[PDB]
Each structure stands twice: as structure tokens, then as C-alpha cells.
């Protein structure tokens, strides 16, 4: 039981691209050095989200076939996946300093209504003990979701997403041959990710009192 050369090539382009992401040291130093207050904490989260959306655009452009999609559908795919991918990555980092980051998140003027499900997701992610390939493929499968709003040619997206779900399943069979439910638990994370879209919308919608960054305002229609 092994990946085909074609699947190995596909997986390789995904890992290479995923592996390039980074948080500038300029930003990380702020997590450690800036004042501790709901206002500052919220501003730091904002800066992090912005840097991530940038990292997310660079990753997506290297996804096999992404650049062959209609230009507007490329935009629609990014706007609809940004929150989901940002929560997936947050999960990853939290499950592998982090002490102070966690403290800032819990004290950034954000309701427990949001914080609670957030930290619970980090927990269920950790319990899965995901590999780097799993995190990368899940991130791409989340990006290449053919069912997002405003997509003109959904079938062209299906064509890119299907092969990723095929490789992810095979990896589960090859690496966890005795736990036939592994794939199923990864999908449970896909559906759990979708719940953060509504939550996030309410966090944005319902605290007008506040300026974000230009990049965030466009992706989230603020």
C-alpha cells in the first residue's frame, strides 16, 4: 500500500509550499514584549491574522492547479477559507512562549462565547496527533472547497479537491492501518472548522467600538 508517483508528486508540492510559511520575528517579539491589555492584545491578534492571510495567499498560489482557476474564483476561494485556515494553523502551533500567547488571546476583549469553542477545537486537534502532511493536506482541502459562495465554476474546484481527499485517505490507511476511523476523525475536523465562520462573523459584526488592517477588511468584508 503506497502512494503512486503522481500522488507523491502532488503531495510533495503541497508540503514544500506548507513548509515555507513563517511568522516574522518582528511579530513574535511583540507577543513577548508588548504591553498586556485587552486593547494591545487585540491589536497583536490583528497583526498576526494579517501576516497569516499573506502566508495563506503564498501557499495557495503554489497549490497544484490553483492558478489555472478563473481569477475571480481564486478570490472567492481565499475569502471563504481564510478563517478556517487561520484556525487550523492556530491549532497546529498551539499543539507544538505559547503560554503568553494563550494569555493574550484569553485577554483581548473577546467573549468566552468564542474563546471556549476555540480552545476546545485546539484540544480535539491535539488529541488527533496530526502529522505535518495531514495539516498541509487539510489546509489545502479547506482552501479548495468547491461549495463556497460566489464561485462560478465549481467543477473546476472539485477536480482539484478530490485528488487531495484521495491522498489524505491513503495516508491514513498506510500510517494508521489498525484505526480505520482515522480519516473519519479528520473529516470531523473539517465540519468543526466551518462553525468558526459564524462565530468569527459575530466577533467582527458585534464589537463595533475596531479598524483592523486593509487586508482583513477585504477578506472579511468589514
Amino acid at each position: 500500500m503506497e502512494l503512486t508517483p503522481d500522488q507523491q508528486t502532488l503531495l510533495h508540492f503541497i508540503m514544500d509550499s506548507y513548509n515555507k510559511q513563517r511568522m516574522p520575528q518582528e511579530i513574535t517579539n511583540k507577543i513577548l514584549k508588548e504591553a498586556f491589555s485587552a486593547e494591545e492584545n487585540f491589536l497583536i491578534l490583528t497583526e498576526m491574522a494579517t501576516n497569516h492571510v499573506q502566508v495563506l495567499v503564498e501557499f495557495t498560489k503554489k497549490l497544484p492547479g490553483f492558478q489555472t482557476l478563473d481569477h475571480e474564483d481564486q478570490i472567492a476561494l481565499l475569502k471563504g477559507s481564510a478563517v478556517e485556515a487561520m484556525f487550523l494553523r492556530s491549532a497546529e502551533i498551539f499543539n507544538k512562549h505559547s503560554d503568553l500567547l494563550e494569555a493574550r488571546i484569553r485577554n483581548s476583549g473577546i467573549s468566552d462565547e468564542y474563546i471556549t469553542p476555540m480552545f476546545s477545537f485546539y484540544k480535539s486537534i491535539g488529541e488527533l496527533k496530526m502529522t505535518q502532511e495531514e495539516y498541509a493536506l487539510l489546509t489545502a482541502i479547506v482552501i479548495l472547497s468547491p461549495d463556497r459562495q460566489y464561485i462560478k465554476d465549481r467543477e473546476a474546484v472539485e477536480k482539484l479537491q478530490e485528488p487531495l481527499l484521495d491522498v489524505l485517505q491513503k495516508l491514513c490507511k498506510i500510517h494508521q492501518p489498525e484505526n480505520p476511523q482515522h480519516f473519519a476523525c479528520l473529516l470531523g475536523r473539517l465540519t468543526e472548522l466551518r462553525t468558526f465562520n459564524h462565530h468569527h462573523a459575530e466577533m467582527l459584526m458585534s464589537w463595533r467600538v475596531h479598524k483592523f488592517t486593509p487586508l482583513l477588511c477585504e477578506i472579511w468584508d468589514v
Partner: peptide, 13 residues
């Protein structure tokens, strides 16, 4: 003119 920054990042090199 919408998503100007997003388009700039997506369309750049």
C-alpha cells in the same frame, strides 16, 4: 475597485 490589496498579493511575484 474591490479587494485591491488581496489582488495585489495574489497577482504579484
Amino acid at each position: 475597485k474591490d479587494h485591491q490589496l488581496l489582488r495585489y498579493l495574489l497577482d504579484k511575484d
